Amino acid sequence: DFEKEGIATVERAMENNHDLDTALLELNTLRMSMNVTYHEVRIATITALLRRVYHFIATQTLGPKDAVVKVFNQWGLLFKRQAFDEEEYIDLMNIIMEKIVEQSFDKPDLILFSALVSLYDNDIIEEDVIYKWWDNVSTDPRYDEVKKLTVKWVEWLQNAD
Structure with a gap:
């Protein structure tokens, strides 16, 4: 139940x-209200953002990259107060990858990257x-597509380190 309501709350604040x-004040109030955890919050927030990105692309209002940037550059900041430790950030990224596949964008790799x-x-x-x-990421082939670009990115990051 919290999911749907959480998605709605975030969709309202971006709109x-x-x-x-x-x-975040409303969302967190809902969080305690319905006694759900931050994992649930991350899921709600991520699917909310990704839906808006999807909508932007499907209606040709903005290209893939532009759509992601338009949404995440502004709202992705919500994540720094929805994850407090390493695994929660790892979880954060896993959800994004998973939800992208679930939403079925046409160039999953570009959306995730x-x-x-x-x-x-x-x-x-x-x-x-x-x-x-990345070291603990799922190797289920179902994620082969969405990982294409980001795998090179992580590699580039290591080299430039």
Whole structure:
């Protein structure tokens, strides 16, 4: 039950353009209200953002990369207060990858690469957690497509380290 309501809460704050502080206040109130954890919150927030990205692309209102950037550059900041330790950030990235596949975008690899890069540029995620996430990432072939681009990115990051 919390899911749907959480998705709705986030969708509202991005739409009728809420500043974050206020979006997180309502969302967190809902979190305690319905007694759910931050994992559930991350799921709700991530699917909410990814749906808006999808909508932007499917309606040709914005190209893939642009759509991801438009959404994540602004709202991805919500994540820094939805994850407090390493595994929670690892979980954060796993969900994004999983939800992208689930949403079925046409160039999964580009969507996931763009989303992670946006977060990286905004300092929500740094190399250390990124390597950890990547080292423990699922090898289920179902993720082969979405990982194509990001795998090179992680590699580039290691070399440039």
